Write a protein that binds this ligand. Structure first.
Ligand SMILES: O=C(O)c1ccc(NC(=O)[C@@H]2c3ccccc3CCN2C(=O)/C=C/c2cc(Cl)ccc2-n2cnnn2)cc1
Length: 238
């Protein structure tokens, strides 16, 4: 996160850190708890990943230093990538992780509500991007979970900023015109959380952008409201 500030412990209890153990253990992506065995993240995170056996999901973490060999994690039973996904820049950048065990909800870890289908026509004014990603393009994974308040940008305005790309209604953009506060390397897959009527909703999934927090280059996020039916399909399967 560029221009972010340290989060407070328990502030974003749906935020998870997805680690890989291959070749060595490190933070790979962000993610969000959406159900007791479900993590919503970005499909592009799994480019290297041939097996869910190398993945570890850590919830209730503020600092990456809390993670050692003796730290409990959730194993991943299955990786479900949207079957229309080709690349982040073309959309469908959404994946689900089915966990091997159930997340026990508490003050450190709980799910975030998905947006309501009716609420597709609501103006979100209190949106925050969180993650352990870089603070600048040439940097490193941050110890403490960072947060940044970011304004949503209309599809029309986002399309003006990305000549040569196709910004679809399945994408949602966010960022200040002058730049400065945005997602960066390592924030991918994490949430874009917006508070509406005192309830937090998972409005976006950090997906892609041209550089980090550049002037007139908003962050591009998967528009979660456009995928509620797909998420229910995969999580409510009979
Ligand atoms: O350990 C590290 O150093 C390290 C760990 C994880 C990483 N992840 C990454 O790079 C991940 C990632 C993970 C797996 C596969 C592919 C990629 C490439 C994209 N990606 C980002 O997070 C994209 C952020 C991004 C998102 C928005 Cl909304 C706006 C601007 C962004 N950026 C543009 N340029 N940088 N960020 C890096 C570095």
């Amino acid at each position: 996160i560029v221009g972010g500030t340290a989060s407070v412990r328990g502030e974003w209890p749906w935020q998870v850190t997805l680690h890989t153990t291959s070749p060595t253990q490190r933070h790979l992506c962000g993610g969000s708890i959406i159900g007791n065995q479900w993590i919503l993240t970005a499909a592009h995170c799994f480019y290297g990943v041939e097996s869910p056996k190398i993945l570890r999901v850590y919830s209730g973490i503020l600092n990456q230093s809390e993670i050692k060999e003796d730290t409990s994690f959730f194993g991943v039973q299955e990786i479900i990538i949207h079957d229309q996904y080709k690349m982040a820049e073309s959309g469908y950048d959404i994946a689900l992780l089915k966990l091997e065990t159930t997340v026990g909800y508490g003050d450190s870890q709980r799910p975030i509500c998905l947006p309501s289908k009716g609420d597709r026509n609501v103006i979100y004014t209190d949106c925050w991007v969180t993650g352990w990603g870089y603070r600048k393009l040439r940097d490193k994974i941050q110890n403490t979970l960072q947060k940044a308040k970011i304004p949503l940008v209309t599809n029309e305005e986002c399309q003006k900023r990305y000549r040569g790309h196709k910004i679809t209604h399945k994408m949602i953009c966010a960022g200040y015109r002058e730049g400065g506060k945005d997602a960066c390397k390592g924030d991918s897959g994490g949430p874009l959380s917006c508070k509406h009527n005192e309830v937090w909703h998972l409005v976006g999934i950090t997906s892609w952008g041209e550089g980090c927090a550049q002037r007139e280059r908003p962050g591009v996020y998967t528009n979660v409201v456009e995928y509620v039916d797909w998420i229910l399909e995969k999580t409510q399967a009979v």
